[PDB]
Amino acid sequence: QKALPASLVPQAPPVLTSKDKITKRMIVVLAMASLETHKISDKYVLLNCDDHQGLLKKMGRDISEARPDITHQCLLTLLDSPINKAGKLQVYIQTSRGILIEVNPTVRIPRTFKRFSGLMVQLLHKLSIRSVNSEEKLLKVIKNPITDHLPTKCRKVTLSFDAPVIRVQDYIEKLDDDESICVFVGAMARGKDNFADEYVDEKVGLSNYPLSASVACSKFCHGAEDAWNIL
Amino acid sequence: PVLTSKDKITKRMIVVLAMASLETHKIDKYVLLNCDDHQGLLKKMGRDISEARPDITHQCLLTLLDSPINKAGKLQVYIQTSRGILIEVNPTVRIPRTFKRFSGLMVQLLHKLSIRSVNSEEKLLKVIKNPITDHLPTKCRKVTLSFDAPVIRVQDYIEKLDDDESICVFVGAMARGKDNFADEYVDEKVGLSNYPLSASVACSKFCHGAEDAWNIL
């Protein structure tokens, strides 16, 4: 009936940067990420709930607010999800102190939190992290606000418990043909969802039961993949 | 309600982590074996450095027990270590969110052979006897997530399953090796995605497809 494409050789899909304003994609912003480096005596360490209770108490900040493991496991989930391998996913990290980090989809986050902590310390002090094979910057610290770097036609939602429950596949289907989706997920233990009220169009909920941030990211990614037939 | 191994009737989702790396070593101090903490000791023991990875099992446990299907109560989790030690995980327990606390709780579980709750009415984590066929319910279908198997849609597979028939999924928490960890147990082998998947993503995909099929929203 219809002619085949000239080459059926499989090709790697293009990787999406903030330079590409046009391409439809899924974007996850891990907001209120607890990523702060502090100097001991002399060792610079990323602040931890388990290993730095004395330092957190001395500085007066609550120990439950120092959770970078949530950001770590959310990065693992997002970057290991099939939508990232298909090349239709972008990840930004919005720390609680106001730092904005762009994650290149080709980076491999170390599976262990110790190596993740060392990588985050070097990223937060050197402002960029390159790769071993080629010197392309896999992690970058970029200028606020996020809406400068976001695609031009993008729909912005916050994942919240109080918002009405939606179906992710139906939402992504209801999106336009040229419009991208941006999802703000609070990468924090216990807060309330004011972190992105200046940016977002609306707040949506994923389930009646409470969810962790990794489960919320995984659910929205799975809905996006079934809506876009990635699999 | 709470699903237990004693129940043999209710249609449920059994997830069996297989070839999990859960090793206790004496140094006395009893420590869980992970490669970054023990680079030299694993090399002295001569086993593979990439084999000792409890973090995979920890991440899979976090995703499974924070999944909404566990909140509804349809899910049940077993952990078959590489040694052969088989663990039943209660749906009510909250696994520690950090790896060091998880390692401590694994050391306590593997040495005491049981973990008792504060209320002590039941056991949060239990060591049960080989095999798993005795503890899984009567009418059940057993599948292995494998890459070379044909790719299926999880929702369609679960709706093709019967009304009184449970599903059992063997997910390899092993880092490297073949998919033959449970071939003699399982009914068949299914593929979830065209791309290779981490065990956490495989558990998340199959759980979320199960929720969409069983209307657990």
Binding site: R115 | C35, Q39, S50, A175
Partner: peptide, 10 residues
């Protein structure tokens, strides 16, 4: 290249 291999050690 890497398929859940994990980042290589030093």
């Amino acid at each position: 290249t890497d398929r859940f291999k994990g980042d290589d050690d030093i």
